[PDB]
Scaffold this active site. Structure first.
Site, PDB file in Angstrom:
ATOM      1  N   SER A 232       0.777  -1.243   0.000  1.00 64.82           N
ATOM      2  CA  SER A 232       0.000   0.000   0.000  1.00 64.82           C
ATOM      3  C   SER A 232       0.812   1.300   0.000  1.00 64.82           C
ATOM      4  O   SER A 232       0.222   2.358  -0.137  1.00 64.82           O
ATOM      5  CB  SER A 232      -0.949   0.022   1.181  1.00 64.82           C
ATOM      6  OG  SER A 232      -1.861  -1.045   1.103  1.00 64.82           O
TER       7      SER A 232
ATOM      8  N   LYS B 237      -0.113   3.387  -2.846  1.00 68.73           N
ATOM      9  CA  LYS B 237      -1.200   4.368  -2.811  1.00 68.73           C
ATOM     10  C   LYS B 237      -0.677   5.814  -2.883  1.00 68.73           C
ATOM     11  O   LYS B 237      -1.386   6.701  -3.359  1.00 68.73           O
ATOM     12  CB  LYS B 237      -2.039   4.171  -1.540  1.00 68.73           C
ATOM     13  CG  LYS B 237      -2.816   2.866  -1.536  1.00 68.73           C
ATOM     14  CD  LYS B 237      -3.614   2.675  -0.250  1.00 68.73           C
ATOM     15  CE  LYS B 237      -4.579   1.470  -0.286  1.00 68.73           C
ATOM     16  NZ  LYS B 237      -3.884   0.166  -0.467  1.00 68.73           N
TER      17      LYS B 237
ATOM     18  N   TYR C 277     -10.551   2.590   5.503  1.00 73.05           N
ATOM     19  CA  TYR C 277      -9.413   2.337   4.632  1.00 73.05           C
ATOM     20  C   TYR C 277      -9.771   1.231   3.633  1.00 73.05           C
ATOM     21  O   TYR C 277     -10.283   0.182   4.017  1.00 73.05           O
ATOM     22  CB  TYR C 277      -8.230   1.951   5.504  1.00 73.05           C
ATOM     23  CG  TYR C 277      -6.935   1.646   4.786  1.00 73.05           C
ATOM     24  CD1 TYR C 277      -6.292   2.617   4.033  1.00 73.05           C
ATOM     25  CD2 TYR C 277      -6.309   0.419   4.954  1.00 73.05           C
ATOM     26  CE1 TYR C 277      -5.071   2.352   3.397  1.00 73.05           C
ATOM     27  CE2 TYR C 277      -5.085   0.146   4.321  1.00 73.05           C
ATOM     28  CZ  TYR C 277      -4.491   1.128   3.542  1.00 73.05           C
ATOM     29  OH  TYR C 277      -3.274   0.875   2.935  1.00 73.05           O
TER      30      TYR C 277
ATOM     31  N   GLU D 151      -0.698  10.076   4.836  1.00 71.07           N
ATOM     32  CA  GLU D 151      -1.386  10.398   6.087  1.00 71.07           C
ATOM     33  C   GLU D 151      -0.374  11.142   6.950  1.00 71.07           C
ATOM     34  O   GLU D 151       0.812  10.760   6.968  1.00 71.07           O
ATOM     35  CB  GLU D 151      -1.831   9.113   6.776  1.00 71.07           C
ATOM     36  CG  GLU D 151      -2.851   8.331   5.949  1.00 71.07           C
ATOM     37  CD  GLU D 151      -3.121   6.933   6.431  1.00 71.07           C
ATOM     38  OE1 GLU D 151      -2.896   6.617   7.622  1.00 71.07           O
ATOM     39  OE2 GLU D 151      -3.576   6.107   5.599  1.00 71.07           O
TER      40      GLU D 151
ATOM     41  N   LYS E 274       3.316   6.388   5.317  1.00 69.62           N
ATOM     42  CA  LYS E 274       2.443   5.363   4.767  1.00 69.62           C
ATOM     43  C   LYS E 274       3.027   3.985   5.025  1.00 69.62           C
ATOM     44  O   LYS E 274       4.224   3.756   4.761  1.00 69.62           O
ATOM     45  CB  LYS E 274       2.235   5.542   3.255  1.00 69.62           C
ATOM     46  CG  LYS E 274       1.192   4.610   2.659  1.00 69.62           C
ATOM     47  CD  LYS E 274      -0.214   4.985   3.078  1.00 69.62           C
ATOM     48  CE  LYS E 274      -1.232   3.913   2.726  1.00 69.62           C
ATOM     49  NZ  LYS E 274      -1.208   2.775   3.635  1.00 69.62           N
ATOM     50  N   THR E 275       2.201   3.066   5.522  1.00 68.30           N
ATOM     51  CA  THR E 275       2.519   1.650   5.616  1.00 68.30           C
ATOM     52  C   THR E 275       2.161   0.926   4.321  1.00 68.30           C
ATOM     53  O   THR E 275       1.251   1.343   3.576  1.00 68.30           O
ATOM     54  CB  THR E 275       1.696   0.963   6.734  1.00 68.30           C
ATOM     55  OG1 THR E 275       0.297   1.212   6.544  1.00 68.30           O
ATOM     56  CG2 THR E 275       2.071   1.466   8.090  1.00 68.30           C
TER      57      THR E 275
ATOM     58  N   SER F  79       1.880  -3.419   2.873  1.00 67.41           N
ATOM     59  CA  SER F  79       2.122  -4.832   3.071  1.00 67.41           C
ATOM     60  C   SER F  79       1.575  -5.648   1.902  1.00 67.41           C
ATOM     61  O   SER F  79       0.611  -5.234   1.234  1.00 67.41           O
ATOM     62  CB  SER F  79       1.430  -5.287   4.358  1.00 67.41           C
ATOM     63  OG  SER F  79       1.825  -4.498   5.471  1.00 67.41           O
TER      64      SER F  79
ATOM     65  N   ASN G 105       6.217  -9.773   5.838  1.00 67.74           N
ATOM     66  CA  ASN G 105       5.132  -8.948   6.355  1.00 67.74           C
ATOM     67  C   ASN G 105       5.076  -9.022   7.879  1.00 67.74           C
ATOM     68  O   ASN G 105       4.298  -9.795   8.457  1.00 67.74           O
ATOM     69  CB  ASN G 105       3.799  -9.370   5.738  1.00 67.74           C
ATOM     70  CG  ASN G 105       2.633  -8.507   6.200  1.00 67.74           C
ATOM     71  OD1 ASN G 105       2.785  -7.564   6.964  1.00 67.74           O
ATOM     72  ND2 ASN G 105       1.452  -8.836   5.716  1.00 67.74           N
TER      73      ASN G 105
END
Ligand SMILES: [Zn+2]
Ligand SMILES: [Zn+2]
Ligand SMILES: [Zn+2]
Ligand SMILES: [Zn+2]
Length: 359
Positions: free
Chosen positions: A62, A65, A148, A269, A312-313, A315, A340
């Site tokens: 992600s 994104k 989300y 974010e 941002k994370t 996985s 992960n």
């Protein structure tokens, strides 16, 4: 000034974590004092023993994104659509659906009204995808709740590219990535780069390496290394060149609503800087990422500025990524791993490293 060498700081935080979670390899990159620093650990492929470098390709999940958001913002600046437009103004096949009442901004920021984290299993082709969105029944009024969602930002990227008359992958690979100077970043890894593509390692410790799924490219499908990802971060802290891309990057730093101490931008974010470990953990916890929350509505979108930590994370089944940066202090961290492993661990390590970089 007066601290221990950066290598000692990073090793001291990263090495114990790699051991605790049995992470085969990790590429770490940081920005400090206007320069990049790379720290490479372990192996990209346990079988071959190939070492991780800042050119190893990882699935960033992600974190994709943020690139999708940048592409979408670019398309809006180029006149393809307005963030304020209703979604079905950019998808004839959605006219008459609930997307008559959702804006492009709401799609991008997960506030359409209850779109879930993942598509249902039956959505496995483009036709099934269109049927899914046509049939969707909102749970909440538009713009009121953040949940989300891959279907949400996935559709945003898809429709944004098409608003310029181009498929998403074409717009990303031929326009956005080259203009950002990212030449080792891919949706589909070409044969010439396959030697650099790490394997991921699953919960059951098996090698896995693929990002299949509907709108995967938009939602979680980028492969890149720490050097390219850090360069993208650098662009988020002073890009010059294409005025449209510059405007697009600024839009990704614009806040649309908040949930607690986290402000939702396009992709990124952010938090007021300095941010405590507890607050950064909470904003990245399942209470925020795995359920709907009512948002603090913003009367208008607002530029969040330089005194922020943006993050941002990301996985996938076999990979765990995290990126965070603070423009006002010129510091940043990228951590790409081929397991992960828990988001809490990513955040704790990153926060500890950034705290040292700021001193
Ligand atoms: Zn250095
Ligand atoms: Zn290129
Ligand atoms: Zn190359
Ligand atoms: Zn509610």
């Amino acid at each position: 000034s007066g601290e221990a060498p950066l290598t000692a700081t990073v090793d001291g935080i990263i090495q114990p974590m790699l051991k605790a979670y049995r992470i085969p390899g990790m590429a770490v990159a940081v920005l400090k004092d206007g320069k990049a620093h790379y720290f490479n650990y372990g192996v990209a492929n346990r079988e071959s023993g190939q070492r991780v470098s800042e050119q190893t390709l990882f699935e960033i999940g992600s974190v994709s994104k943020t690139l999708t958001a940048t592409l979408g913002a670019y398309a809006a600046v180029k006149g393809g659509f307005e963030l304020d437009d209703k979604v079905s103004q950019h998808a004839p096949w959605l006219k008459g659906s609930a997307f008559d009442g959702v804006t492009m901004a709401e799609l991008a920021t997960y506030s359409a009204g209850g779109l879930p984290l993942q598509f249902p299993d039956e959505v496995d082709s483009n036709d099934k995808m269109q049927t899914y969105y046509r049939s969707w029944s909102p749970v909440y009024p538009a713009g009121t709740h953040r949940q989300y969602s891959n279907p949400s930002i996935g559709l945003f990227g898809h429709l944004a590219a098409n608003s310029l008359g181009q498929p998403f992958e074409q717009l990303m690979s031929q326009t956005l990535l080259p203009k950002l100077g990212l030449h080792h970043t891919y949706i589909q890894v070409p044969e010439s780069a396959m030697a650099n593509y790490a394997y991921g390692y699953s919960k059951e410790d098996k090698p896995i390496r693929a990002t299949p799924g509907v709108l995967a490219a938009e939602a979680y499908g980028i492969k890149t290394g720490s050097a390219d990802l850090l360069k993208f971060v650098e662009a988020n802290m002073g890009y010059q060149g294409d005025a449209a891309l510059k405007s697009a990057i600024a839009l990704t730093h614009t806040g649309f609503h908040s949930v607690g101490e986290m402000t939702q931008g396009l992709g990124w974010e952010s938090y007021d800087y300095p941010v405590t470990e507890q607050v950064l953990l909470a904003g990245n916890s399942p209470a925020v990422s795995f359920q709907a929350n009512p948002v603090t509505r913003f009367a208008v979108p607002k530029a969040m500025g330089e005194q922020r930590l943006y993050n941002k994370t990301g996985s996938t089944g076999g990979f765990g990524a995290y990126v965070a940066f603070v423009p006002a202090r010129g510091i940043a961290i990228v951590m790409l791993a081929n397991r992960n492993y828990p988001i809490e661990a990513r955040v704790k390590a990153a926060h500890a490293i950034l705290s040292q970089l700021a001193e």
